[PDB]
Amino acid sequence: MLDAFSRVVEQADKKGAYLSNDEINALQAIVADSNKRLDVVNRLTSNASSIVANAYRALVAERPQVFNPGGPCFHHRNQAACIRDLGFILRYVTYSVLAGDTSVMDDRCLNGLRETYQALGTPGDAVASGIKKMKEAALKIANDPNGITKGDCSQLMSELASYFDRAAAAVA
Amino acid sequence: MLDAFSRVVEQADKKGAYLSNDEINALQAIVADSNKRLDVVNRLTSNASSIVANAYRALVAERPQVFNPGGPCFHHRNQAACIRDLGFILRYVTYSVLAGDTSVMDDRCLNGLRETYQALGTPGDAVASGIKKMKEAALKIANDPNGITKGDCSQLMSELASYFDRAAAAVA
Amino acid sequence: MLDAFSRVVEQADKKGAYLSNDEINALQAIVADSNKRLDVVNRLTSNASSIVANAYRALVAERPQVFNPGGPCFHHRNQAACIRDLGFILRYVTYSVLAGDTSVMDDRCLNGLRETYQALGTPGDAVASGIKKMKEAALKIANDPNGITKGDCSQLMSELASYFDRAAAAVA
Amino acid sequence: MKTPLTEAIAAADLRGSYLSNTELQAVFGRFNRARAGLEAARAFANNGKKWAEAAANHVYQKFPYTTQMQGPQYASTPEGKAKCVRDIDHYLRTISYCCVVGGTGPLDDYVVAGLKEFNSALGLSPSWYIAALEFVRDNHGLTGDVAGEANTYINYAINALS
Amino acid sequence: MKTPLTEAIAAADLRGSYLSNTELQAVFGRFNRARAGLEAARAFANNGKKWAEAAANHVYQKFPYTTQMQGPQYASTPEGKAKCVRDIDHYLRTISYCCVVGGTGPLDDYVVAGLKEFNSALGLSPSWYIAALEFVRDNHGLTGDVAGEANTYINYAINALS
Amino acid sequence: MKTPLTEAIAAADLRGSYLSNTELQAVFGRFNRARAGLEAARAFANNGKKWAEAAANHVYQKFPYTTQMQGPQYASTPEGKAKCVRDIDHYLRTISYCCVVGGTGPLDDYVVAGLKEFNSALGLSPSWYIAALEFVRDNHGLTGDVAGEANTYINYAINALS
Numbered sequence A, B, C: 001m002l003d004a005f006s007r008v009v010e011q012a013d014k015k016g017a018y019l020s021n022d023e024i025n026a027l028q029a030i031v032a033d034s035n036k037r038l039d040v041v042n043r044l045t046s047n048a049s050s051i052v053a054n055a056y057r058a059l060v061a062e063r064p065q066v067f068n069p070g071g072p073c074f075h076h077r078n079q080a081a082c083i084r085d086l087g088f089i090l091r092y093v094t095y096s097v098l099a100g101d102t103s104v105m106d107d108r109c110l111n112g113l114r115e116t117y118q119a120l121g122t123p124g125d126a127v128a129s130g131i132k133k134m135k136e137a138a139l140k141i142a143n144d145p146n147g148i149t150k151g152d153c154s155q156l157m158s159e160l161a162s163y164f165d166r167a168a169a170a171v172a
Numbered sequence D, E, F: 001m002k003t004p005l006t007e008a009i010a011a012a013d014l015r016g017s018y019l020s021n022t023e024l025q026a027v028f029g030r031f032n033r034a035r036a037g038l039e040a041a042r043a044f045a046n047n048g049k050k051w052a053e054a055a056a057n058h059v060y061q062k063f064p065y066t067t068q069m070q071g072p073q074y075a076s077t078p079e080g081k082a083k084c085v086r087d088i089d090h091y092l093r094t095i096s097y098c099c100v101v102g103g104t105g106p107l108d109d110y111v112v113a114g115l116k117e118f119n120s121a122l123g124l125s126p127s128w129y130i131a132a133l134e135f136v137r138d139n140h141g142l143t144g145d146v147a148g149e150a151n152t153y154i155n156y157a158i159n160a161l162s
């Protein structure tokens, strides 16, 4: 498993060189916005249950055929499995905003996921739609101007939105 | 695992409808011939050891080259393995006559069987011949007019013969 | 697992015949040179640590790029893994000189080795070079005229050199 | 899924033997009670949707907080009523399947497996589902042997929710 | 298969080390006794079929119930006698292999593995096989070191059947 | 590799939950101490090769048996001196990475994993490496917060060798 600091160390080791001026500075930039990064990691965690629950409610509305009889997700076992999987994606996107690196989401979550869904009969484009809705629902909560010191956390929203996009392009 | 009653329930659920008049009737027909069905499940079980033992004796006669040196089935470990495998097919055909469905034979017996024999050097056409002989030996015992109330159990013999045929087309 | 005596027995069984005059004689020839065979099995074992340690020192000299940063074998975990793997090949070549058969080296060492190295990023031509150096280092020790009754053990050196060659053609 | 036929075959397969004397009588027992189960599913086939439409109206009278609440997650809207008949119809449909089967199997996989996780995730109260299921139990108007098979599986669903 | 050479290599491999001092002497012991084993297999190669043809005739005199019984599964027919020499020849052939090997290995895999299951399945009595194997043990007419190696593996087969 | 950020995420993932209150403060603790670690790696980036060239010369004065020994495996030849600066430079480079990381991780995987096996295989004495690492610890000339982060990881490498 790798974090943002250890990603650049693994690259620095592969060329047998110490970190350069630009490599220490771009990493010092992460320590500089770390307070805002941890605010994002807290907001997604606190509203975890809420983000996955509503993204589902929106997905069933967008694709009703999928969740009722004859669809890939009918039965209580399946409805729970879908919410669980959406809760997994979110939990790993949260781990990625913390690490600053995407290896955690990649290694133990997204690996043979497209293959799992293909072998199970689960769509993929419907899981991508679910992840996309979780993105929209996560950006509202994470960038809420209320109850926080006012500032700019744009590069965090861009990065957070990219991590959801990476999780959707892996199932579609 | 599925039985005859749960096969039609899984189909009924997939279209989100209750069982129709014809679906309850064709299933009531199974309860109507169930006494004869259980007579078949008893006769194959009682003469289990006898059916597999004789089908082997006939197979070695039909294909002697296979069981003596240089053949795929020489050595005591292999001769026992062949009888065991023939005992397995029979036991699962018996489970299929009971369930009225073939899922049990299919799921945990016939699945990667053609692949197992290909990777082991075991023929397949010789295992099919063994299963075919077990069929002929099973139909004589199962449809014996003696020691039973006289009647018609044709649809049971047809179904029982089909289950052996399904087990042979899976190895050939 | 098979030895030289059981290799010819497995062949003799496959044709359903006892061992012929030539088969007992070529095997009696192995019992005749067995004293020299066990001298080879002792010399490789005693100088085990020495043969793998020096073959490595020669490999790093031949291919320095491989062991320093950016190479497939940098880090202490990897340098130890390379010496361990070279110690494995040697240990199995020693088992092959003892058995007179190569099945032991083949079955539990060389099997999916080319596939392991391909999936790990380890060269193969560099592992072959390492095995080749172990051969040259093994032939000097195994055929040392000192501390031994003087005689001819040519067919042992030829066979021992072939076992290293078989282990290299399996990774290259 | 779990049917007495499957239950015996699974147990038998575990031991690697054929059906025991005890297991065969358990299977012969399924067929001596099966007719009443198929006739139970015939009552549900013809009048299950009608019992579901009434059970949905019963909960709007037993629990008033469902029809007077918000729009994004409650039964105030006419679309929510359509989902309430649908859910109750899914339950009744699955209970009919249990009678055709002679076991808990359809309820086990279709509704009981992952029930408490889903309701707790979507803000659904089992209180509403038990209420509408207690209604159709006392309103079906079934005989005896056919009613025994109907009542066994309706009260297994009520035991699974409470 | 199990040969003392293989037995030591398997044990060594388990520990992930080379052969111990104790294991090497066990291997040096194989070669000091191997010549007598190869000369044993030479006696069997030249006169094993002849000893099998006599052993088959011995059982038809020790146990009368084999030659006077039915046709589909017994030694009454001249085809059954051909299978009796064949089986005894397979046994003697496998014992010769044991001497060439210096261990129980060939008997272990070719005849002992799954012996009792097969005989109990095909109505074969080990009583006949022990009887014909006790014959060739007392009729071979072998020396001493070559006879010791012949007797060890014939009496391992008799121990495996009884 | 082991970084406090990774350590918390691994522990969290094991429990299948998000970060606990205790784990978050452990992560907030990483960032409040990270600046000194990055400034430590900046000192190493600019003067690490220079400290390695001096540490190599120190061992040829502390332990005389390295420069007066044989050619195929010792530091007598000018090529061996080039490998001594290289090894010490690899160590210092890996320690810099530890400060950038805020944990033992780079030392754990790059040098500690399989250290004792390698040195014992190639006739290398850890005595030389501890000696040259004790030098650059007392010769670096670093402040306090940046020096605390430098000293923590140099003395973890010394603890790993002894």
Ligand SMILES: *[C@H](C)C1/C(=C/c2[nH]c(/C=C3N=C(/C=C4\NC(=O)C(CC)=C4C)C(C)=C\3CCC(=O)O)c(CCC(=O)O)c2C)NC(=O)C1C
Pocket (backbone or CB within 6 Å): A057, A060, A067, A073, A074, A075, A076, A079, D059, D066, D072, D073, D074, D075, D080, D081, D083, D084, D085, D087, D088, D090, D091, D094, D110, D111, D122, D123, D124, D128, D129, D132
């Ligand atoms: C009627 C008792 C009331 C009504 C029920 C209600 N439920 C939901 C949410 C869902 N219910 C299901 C139904 C099932 N899917 C299954 O696989 C099974 C097992 C056979 C069942 C029973 C599903 C799939 C959902 C979610 C998808 C959907 O929106 O339909 C709602 C939706 C409201 C929400 O989003 O929370 C409703 C209205 N509501 C009441 O208050 C009742 C008393």
Ligand SMILES: *[C@H](C)C1/C(=C/c2[nH]c(/C=C3N=C(/C=C4\NC(=O)C(CC)=C4C)C(C)=C\3CCC(=O)O)c(CCC(=O)O)c2C)NC(=O)C1C
Pocket (backbone or CB within 6 Å): B057, B060, B067, B073, B074, B075, B076, B079, E059, E066, E072, E073, E074, E075, E080, E081, E083, E084, E085, E087, E088, E090, E091, E094, E110, E111, E122, E123, E124, E128, E129, E132
């Ligand atoms: C001689 C002692 C008598 C004779 C023996 C007999 N055996 C069978 C049945 C079989 N025996 C074998 C032989 C082997 N196959 C192996 O792999 C091994 C291990 C090396 C052995 C020993 C086999 C393959 C069979 C079955 C196939 C076949 O029919 O040959 C028979 C056949 C009678 C039957 O079908 O039951 C016979 C006649 N019979 C006696 O009564 C003897 C005293």
Ligand SMILES: *[C@H](C)C1/C(=C/c2[nH]c(/C=C3N=C(/C=C4\NC(=O)C(CC)=C4C)C(C)=C\3CCC(=O)O)c(CCC(=O)O)c2C)NC(=O)C1C
Pocket (backbone or CB within 6 Å): C057, C060, C067, C073, C074, C075, C076, C079, F059, F066, F072, F073, F074, F075, F080, F081, F083, F084, F085, F087, F088, F090, F091, F094, F110, F111, F122, F123, F124, F128, F129, F132
């Ligand atoms: C300097 C303290 C002295 C010098 C050291 C020395 N070491 C070797 C052997 C090797 N050292 C390494 C280095 C590493 N590879 C790694 O992956 C890591 C972890 C980051 C390290 C530190 C390697 C790869 C080797 C073997 C390959 C090689 O020959 O370079 C030698 C070579 C002598 C030999 O073959 O035994 C030397 C000279 N020697 C001293 O005596 C010092 C005091």
Ligand SMILES: *[C@H](C)[C@H]1/C(=C/c2[nH]c(/C=C3N=C(/C=C4\NC(=O)C(CC)=C4C)C(C)=C\3CCC(=O)O)c(CCC(=O)O)c2C)NC(=O)[C@@H]1C
Pocket (backbone or CB within 6 Å): A066, A072, A073, A078, A081, A082, A083, A085, A086, A088, A108, A109, A110, A113, A116, A120, A121, A122, A123, A124, A126, A127, A130
């Ligand atoms: C919901 C958006 C969609 C949906 C999902 C769905 N998932 C499953 C079952 C599985 N999901 C996974 C994935 C993971 N399991 C893990 O532990 C992890 C973390 C490492 C991941 C990423 C796996 C392995 C399974 C199978 C094992 C299991 O059952 O838990 C199902 C069930 C498929 C079925 O039909 O049985 C479904 C349906 N289904 C949808 O329709 C939505 C689009």
Ligand SMILES: *[C@H](C)[C@H]1/C(=C/c2[nH]c(/C=C3N=C(/C=C4\NC(=O)C(CC)=C4C)C(C)=C\3CCC(=O)O)c(CCC(=O)O)c2C)NC(=O)[C@@H]1C
Pocket (backbone or CB within 6 Å): A032, A033, A035, A036, A037, A038, A039, A040, A042, A142, A143, A144, A145, A148, A149, A150, A151, A152, A153, A156, F024, F025, F028
């Ligand atoms: C961007 C998402 C939004 C935003 C964020 C923002 N955060 C800070 C600074 C701080 N955040 C914390 C809060 C904590 N994170 C933790 O993990 C913990 C431990 C439980 C705490 C307490 C803290 C302590 C700070 C610093 C002090 C403070 O609260 O001001 C800022 C201020 C700028 C800075 O980085 O110092 C901002 C702006 N601002 C937005 O507009 C977005 C909605």
Ligand SMILES: *[C@H](C)[C@H]1/C(=C/c2[nH]c(/C=C3N=C(/C=C4\NC(=O)C(CC)=C4C)C(C)=C\3CCC(=O)O)c(CCC(=O)O)c2C)NC(=O)[C@@H]1C
Pocket (backbone or CB within 6 Å): B066, B072, B073, B078, B081, B082, B083, B085, B086, B088, B108, B109, B110, B113, B116, B120, B121, B122, B123, B124, B126, B127, B130
């Ligand atoms: C006899 C008609 C033929 C024959 C059969 C034969 N089978 C094996 C070994 C195996 N058979 C199976 C199949 C199953 N094992 C199971 O447990 C089940 C139930 C789920 C099945 C269907 C498997 C997996 C094996 C391998 C494992 C084992 O050894 O038990 C062999 C041995 C192959 C060999 O040469 O070693 C043989 C020979 N062989 C014939 O010649 C007949 C045509």
Ligand SMILES: *[C@H](C)[C@H]1/C(=C/c2[nH]c(/C=C3N=C(/C=C4\NC(=O)C(CC)=C4C)C(C)=C\3CCC(=O)O)c(CCC(=O)O)c2C)NC(=O)[C@@H]1C
Pocket (backbone or CB within 6 Å): B032, B033, B035, B036, B037, B038, B039, B040, B042, B142, B143, B144, B145, B148, B149, B150, B151, B152, B153, B156, D024, D025, D028
């Ligand atoms: C078709 C294979 C042959 C045939 C069968 C046949 N069976 C019955 C009816 C019965 N069979 C049983 C026997 C049992 N099966 C069990 O599992 C158990 C429990 C151990 C028992 C006791 C019973 C009890 C009956 C019913 C009463 C009876 O014996 O008559 C029939 C009669 C028709 C019917 O279904 O009622 C028949 C004809 N008849 C044939 O000709 C085939 C050889």
Ligand SMILES: *[C@H](C)[C@H]1/C(=C/c2[nH]c(/C=C3N=C(/C=C4\NC(=O)C(CC)=C4C)C(C)=C\3CCC(=O)O)c(CCC(=O)O)c2C)NC(=O)[C@@H]1C
Pocket (backbone or CB within 6 Å): C066, C072, C073, C078, C081, C082, C083, C085, C086, C088, C108, C109, C110, C113, C116, C120, C121, C122, C123, C124, C126, C127, C130
């Ligand atoms: C040294 C000559 C070269 C080299 C070798 C190297 N090996 C590994 C790791 C593995 N090697 C094997 C092979 C075996 N493991 C066994 O137990 C046995 C006996 C049955 C064999 C034959 C395996 C399975 C591994 C992976 C598991 C493990 O780590 O032990 C590595 C590590 C690869 C990496 O980059 O992580 C290396 C490097 N590498 C070289 O550059 C030399 C050419």
Ligand SMILES: *[C@H](C)[C@H]1/C(=C/c2[nH]c(/C=C3N=C(/C=C4\NC(=O)C(CC)=C4C)C(C)=C\3CCC(=O)O)c(CCC(=O)O)c2C)NC(=O)[C@@H]1C
Pocket (backbone or CB within 6 Å): C032, C033, C035, C036, C037, C038, C039, C040, C042, C142, C143, C144, C145, C148, C149, C150, C151, C152, C153, C156, E024, E025, E028
């Ligand atoms: C060929 C590699 C070299 C060579 C060998 C050679 N060996 C012998 C004979 C013997 N070797 C042993 C030694 C042992 N091997 C063991 O496993 C053990 C148990 C620990 C021992 C003691 C023995 C006992 C002998 C026999 C007596 C003796 O030492 O002479 C010979 C002699 C010929 C023969 O086979 O009898 C030779 C020549 N000779 C070479 O020139 C090669 C360098």
